[PDB]
Design an enzyme around this catalytic site. Structure first.
Site, PDB file in Angstrom:
ATOM      1  N   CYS A   1     -64.319 152.263  -4.602  1.00 44.23           N
ATOM      2  CA  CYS A   1     -64.808 151.112  -4.917  1.00 44.23           C
ATOM      3  C   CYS A   1     -65.493 150.420  -3.527  1.00 44.23           C
ATOM      4  CB  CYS A   1     -64.509 150.194  -6.301  1.00 44.23           C
ATOM      5  SG  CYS A   1     -65.364 148.476  -6.647  1.00 44.23           S
ATOM      6  N   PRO A   2     -65.146 150.486  -1.693  1.00 48.42           N
ATOM      7  CA  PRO A   2     -65.890 149.722  -1.152  1.00 48.42           C
ATOM      8  C   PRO A   2     -67.184 148.570  -0.693  1.00 48.42           C
ATOM      9  CG  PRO A   2     -66.229 152.495  -1.200  1.00 48.42           C
ATOM     10  CD  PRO A   2     -65.620 152.035  -2.124  1.00 48.42           C
ATOM     11  N   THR A   3     -68.216 149.681  -2.047  1.00 49.04           N
ATOM     12  CA  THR A   3     -69.533 149.781  -2.460  1.00 49.04           C
ATOM     13  C   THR A   3     -69.748 150.174  -3.286  1.00 49.04           C
ATOM     14  OG1 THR A   3     -71.753 148.743  -1.374  1.00 49.04           O
ATOM     15  CG2 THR A   3     -71.030 149.971  -0.370  1.00 49.04           C
TER      16      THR A   3
ATOM     17  N   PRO B   1     -59.948 152.562  -9.113  1.00 45.55           N
ATOM     18  CA  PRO B   1     -60.183 151.894  -7.747  1.00 45.55           C
ATOM     19  C   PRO B   1     -61.085 152.795  -7.276  1.00 45.55           C
ATOM     20  CG  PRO B   1     -58.228 153.434  -8.924  1.00 45.55           C
ATOM     21  CD  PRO B   1     -59.213 152.755 -10.500  1.00 45.55           C
TER      22      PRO B   1
ATOM     23  N   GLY C   1     -64.684 155.265  -7.076  1.00 49.72           N
ATOM     24  CA  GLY C   1     -66.104 154.879  -7.220  1.00 49.72           C
ATOM     25  C   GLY C   1     -66.229 156.634  -7.274  1.00 49.72           C
TER      26      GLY C   1
END
Lengths: 163, 171, 172, 172, 169, 168, 174, 166, 171, 165, 167, 167
Positions: free
Chosen positions: K48-50, K144, K146
């Site tokens: 989930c960085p983007t 956490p 993605g």
């Protein structure tokens, strides 16, 4: 009713390879002919080990019978043991039908499944062409199964149906 | 019109004459044995006292052939008894050697659908059974007509060969 | 229902092939002649015809008894031509003297109650019909078992013998 | 509403029956083609074809289907045993010979009836071609009178579309 | 539905040269008809419909009239026809547009699609005698071919005239 | 089953055209207000721009009263939009300001029993439903005749006075 | 099932004894052919709900005559009940001697015919039915029982089917 | 047939009645322990000089000592039942009513007593005598042009409370 | 068996019983009220004012509800027969007097148990406040324990609020 | 909901001055508690009085009570709604915490949630220090609960409590 | 029961979604005749960085292969309108052409079996449904960790070439 | 549990394994402390690839570098693997293999994950990541005919450890 002679016998739907050809057969198919269906735990084991009767199938042609082996292994599992020759750890070429029950179902029809190792037993099933169960034979996995006696138990019921 | 070869042979049972006195029998007792059953118009019919007597003299062999014949009518039991003890010279069955199935109810001649409409009689049919209770043959004739044994016997001898050999060439 | 002898005979209508030819045939069209109908299984396989070969050969034995023979199965109408056309040598019907009626519609087989819904091909029946439009003798066999032309011929004359002489003391 | 004319919307019918493959016997329920494009076509009677197309056309043109993940299948009311010997017949005589597609028929009459090609006149069939996607949803319905034929390209036109649609869709 | 059986009587408003009349399967007796259905009116165009339009001349030689029908109406039909097709629209069809509000036309050919108010894509061929010749039905998303229709026209012609000629071929 | 002017109304799911966009809507959406439902025979018709268009003229009179109105008929989900972009000069809807609902299967029409067998185009309707989702006013005419907004408006305020004020 | 009636059909045919100008006289639809029958309903009589809604059509009757229109009002009440009610002065809360034809639904053939009858109550919902010369149905106004009705809208529905029936019977104006 | 009998359950009825110029919800079984005399007529305002009904109200006080209450009913609305009550005896009315005036448009009440008539929509003059167990006892049907004698049902209700008592 | 989950969305439960009105009887039930907003309030029992009593108050307050078109309805598990003796009492004794709203007694305690506002622990009831629109739907639910009282001026307000969102708009 | 038995336990995270902190009802034991609800966040439409509970909250404090607002909303969703200024006017600014149970438990514990929506109603619950349910009131979706209406009743309870019946 | 197997049809779902700043009801039957990939997450306003910051870009790369990209949370409708309509700079989504679908009733959440009654949230699930309404692929990840967008495309072309050439 | 979620603890499994042409006894409980992947297959001697299960054995380094244990399992017979093993990739086989072949003739494992089919013995090709704590991480469900991604396996696998340390 369950594994008992002179009564209906469970009618399954088989999916297998004949002479190196996947074919769809069921008990309603071979009907009209003597059927002998004997299972085994898995493919590629060490006994007869399904050898004699293969090349001895002919006597059953003289006796008008179908010789069918079944294992928990699917068609693909049987095919490999078919093509690869005897010298290589195979059976060479097959003179008899190798029927794959992967679904596990046909074995549960015969009370031949062992919860432990999860596969069918050495149980064999003699059939006349009535769709009826005749003689019950079940041997331990580690113990190999009769040949000439197979054929003899056969002529006997033949004798009685005749006389 | 609903009856076929692949159809299992019906139940009849009822009452019948055997070896002197009255012994009740069932079709489920004849399992594994070969069963022949034919129907006749009535007891003491004028036409001839012969063809019923015909299937009588063949029994010995039918027995050795693994098979048995049954004559059935719509008459009551006390009749077959009467008709049996009557000498052949007298127009009687003179102790026929086969079990005689008397169906008063009509339910046997109806079951097999050999029961007549115009009158209460039944057409003369013949049916044979395998070791398993299934019906392999359905045959029926015309009232004044009789029936030959060399037909039945022939056909039987064939039913034995197909069950053993499956399907092979003639002879 | 429940077909019995000594009954009116179901009127059948169908296209059959005689001497390779194509003619529309009924029961009305043979009226007054004795006529035999017998259903057989699907063509071009391993089959009973120790009967059929015999019946072809023995066609004469019928005419002499004033009888027409007809082979009626549910096979494709055009199938039967080829089936005759196949030489006796290969185990075909070669050439024949006997009518082959198409039951392909299968009304005619549900007519005679020899039609079975199981395999779609009809069981081996035998029927006879007097000059008067009446059904005389039913023989129904099983696939694996054959048939005697003799018994047939034998059963025939008996009927005619009544239609001519009447009843006599002696029987079979 | 679905028993008269089959819809391009709902699932296509299911059929089990005895078939001929490379001059041997096979058993096929249509579920072995699951994941693949299916093409069903018919013909009224055996040993007769109006035009060599629609049958040998496709068979000879079979290699094309193989590459399209598409198999073709021949249906009729003739018996399993009948296609057998037809398959054995020469092209010098107007037989089939080598057959690169399955010929699956139904004696029970059930199939062609549940596909809506069945008739109470002939009793055989109407020549026409359906199509079934990999999933086996109904796609295309085609029904023509017996004498008329069928184009291999017509099938091969829509085909590049139905496959185009799943892979691409309608872009205008 | 079968080829050999005749087609059912259809009646109602029609759009011809931007003019309202009634058409009958009878009105065309002696001229082969090919009528076809599309999904709906105002459905954007590779010009499947306008295609057959371009080729209308190819029909008449063969004594064949073409009519496009949907469950839209003589009112929706006339409009769509009116547009230059340059943006949306149709242009002049050169053939009768047919409109059944009741959807009893499509219910009459068993093309009618339950889930929407529309009928499938299908091609119906009728002889002069009012009897039907053949039947075609596609899925919605797939297009069609005018040449396939020409061949089809010819076939039920060459047999219906010069005879089926089973021999050779 | 008779249809009485006050009964809980029929559930109907159509395709409505709003702001040049298709949006698929139900009654529970328009729950909590008055619906005014009228039906016109078809699109691209002969006459009566005024009647249908009329509502789009003044939306205030309805919304102000907490009342949404609905244009609905048996036509193409597409054709609706076609006609709407079309403008008065040529007799089109010219961007109607109330959502345009398309009856395709015909499920919604005969539900309110407005469907016509003989023709197939809808008998012209008018309806009023309380915010609670229950029917109030049922009006039907022959295809030729239209409707006045003075009346539908009065009839609006005839429902607003009653549920607050009863009958005095 | 009767269900709802799309107003293209010949209007319901009503037959039974009625009230005209303080007497009993029997009437029907076949009586009025060629005229315009405006036939509206009210649930009850002697009630507390506003007569004005009712006397509106009553005293305004002078429109319809020159406009070729007869007005009629019917309810679940009787014909006898009918009389004395209009005999009430509006000071006792009455009608003020209003002259219009008064039908009574009793055998209930009238009501089920227009589908304005109610199963739990028996007090007719407020229906309105316009009838052209031919004895056919044209417009249908059914309000809620509490709801009233007025002529401004009524006579309007008149001058439409008049204009439209007179000319441009296909292509209308509004 | 489809016929009603006495010495059996009485058809159950409910609805708006008038009591001393008032609307009151009532129920048949609410009358138990008492004798219920229910009579019918064709309609309200349909009587030219209905001496017959005025009668009951004037002698009514006897029924009370006799533990019985008689109730007038028609197909006319609870409103149709009032105005005639509030109207003076002089010209169009009965005045103060010492009996209940019941109103049912639903007409199930009459179709239940088989006093209903398929001709005018208005029922006949029925009379139903009902014991405190609510059991139908007397059944009396009469004509529009004809009236009724109170002293008659009197005898009866004396004959009924007797046939029970001994 | 879980507590009544009942809310101000669905149609309000039905009540029917003998009401004490004007000093005489009556039979009231929720069906009888259409065209008028119902306020149905409850409480523990009769002949108890304690700290809170709004009973005589709400009597003098009928003019405020009648200008909003609201019929107010008293209720408890008491007996009409209890309710009849406390109606013909005078305020000077600690009575009530002639009542400007109907007095309901639910003896079987079915209506009470219907609203989830019936208390097992003891036979009394709670002090309810309920807004029922002419459509039969339930706008408002309030329940106070016995010791705590209910606002008149508040509920007066509660009307205009619900009644507003049904006229001008809600959003 | 049988305002006798002690109120049902509610649990979860609320909003404390720009930060999330866990709060249990038993944590408020010893002090009065008024806990209400509403359909959702980020709604201009709904009454602006919800803040009028947050604004006069100092009242209740000196009245020895805490108000807690709940919802079928999310801990995170409440977060942003808080931070929105009155300019916008979505939440304006409210001191009072936002208690969010993503599980829909608390709300269903009071049965004020319903399936016609997938959210709760506008409820009112006054609780004594002991955690014992005394008062029960539920508003329709559209109408809001009064600020004065609460104060009244809450002043009614102690009067009985201290002084008696 | 158990986890959901692909070969079967994708269970019927509906609900109110956000598009171009409007609330528009939808259905799967509506998006039939074409591919759709449904993915979920715990909640709105989540940084989930983007993820959605990603999908507002490579949508056309999707579209070209013919796909309808669709988001769903367990959130309210208005939690959606809020987040998107706020500008990125203050923590909003700007203008999102990706329809934002909401679960108040968590019907779609219990429908695909991605929802955990524990956290009161639903896992990030992923679903591939061919034009026939048949299910292909399921990728369920956590809060956490993605998903890969470029991967999505790959797996999409996966079943295509299988369904086209079977190979 | 009935439905299988990421947060829940990975379902327990034992059985017969294949390591250097021999027969081994393992179970998950023994692999505690490391990351453990599970992908399945329908059967031995399938079609459309030699290579799909070859991909991981040749990629053993990949999961080693990141400290992760990998296991290959099918509904097949412990022996079928021996046969399918000594058969060369040019022969339609492997002949050289690293990651253990777990046989399941009980169907206890497959079923447990919900990758074991109804209609037949063929099981779907699944993917399962187990952290050192025996907790589940994610589930990736593919078809029989469709392959899977190695590089897509590492992308989730790496990021799991990513929060493990870096939070």
């Amino acid at each position: 009713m369950v594994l008992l002679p002179n009564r209906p016998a469970p009618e399954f739907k088989g999916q297998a390879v004949i002479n190196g050809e996947f074919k769809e057969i069921c008990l309603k198919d071979y009907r009209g002919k003597y059927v002998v269906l004997f299972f085994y735990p898995a493919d590629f084991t060490f006994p007869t080990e399904i050898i004699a009767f293969s090349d001895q199938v002919e006597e059953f042609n003289s006796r008008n019978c179908q010789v069918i082996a079944c294992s928990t292994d699917s068609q693909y599992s049987h095919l490999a043991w078919d093509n690869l020759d005897r010298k290589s750890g195979g059976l060479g070429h097959m003179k008899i039908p190798l029927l794959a029950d992967r679904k596990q179902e046909i074995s549960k029809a015969y009370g031949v499944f062992d919860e432990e190792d999860g596969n069918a037993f050495r149980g064999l099933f003699i059939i006349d062409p009535n769709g009826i169960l005749r003689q019950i034979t079940i041997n331990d996995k580690p113990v190999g199964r009769s040949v000439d006696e197979t054929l003899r138990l056969l002529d006997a019921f033949q004798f009685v149906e005749k006389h």
